[PDB]
């Protein structure tokens, strides 16, 4: 799983 924001 992965989650990234900007």
Author numbering: 707 to 712
Sentences from the study reporting this entry:
The ice-nucleation protein InaZ is produced by P. syringae and localized to its outer membrane. We chose to further investigate a segment whose sequence, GSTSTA, appears identically five times within InaZ at residues 707–712, 755–760, 803–808, 851–856 and 899–904. The benefits of racemic protein crystals for structure determination by MicroED were evaluated and it was confirmed that the phase restriction introduced by crystal centrosymmetry increases the number of successful trials during the ab initio phasing of the electron diffraction data.
X-ray diffraction from a single crystal of l-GSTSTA yielded a 91.7% complete data set to approximately 1.1 Å resolution, while data sets from three crystals of l-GSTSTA obtained by MicroED were merged to achieve a data set with an overall completeness of 86.4% at 0.9 Å resolution. Atomic structure solutions were determined for l-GSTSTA from both microfocal X-ray and MicroED data by direct methods (Sheldrick, 2008). Homochiral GSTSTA forms a class 8 zipper in which two in-register, antiparallel β-sheets meet, related by a 180° rotation normal to the protofibril growth axis. The l-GSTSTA protofibril appears tightly restrained within the crystal structure, as shown by a mean B factor of 0.92 Å2.
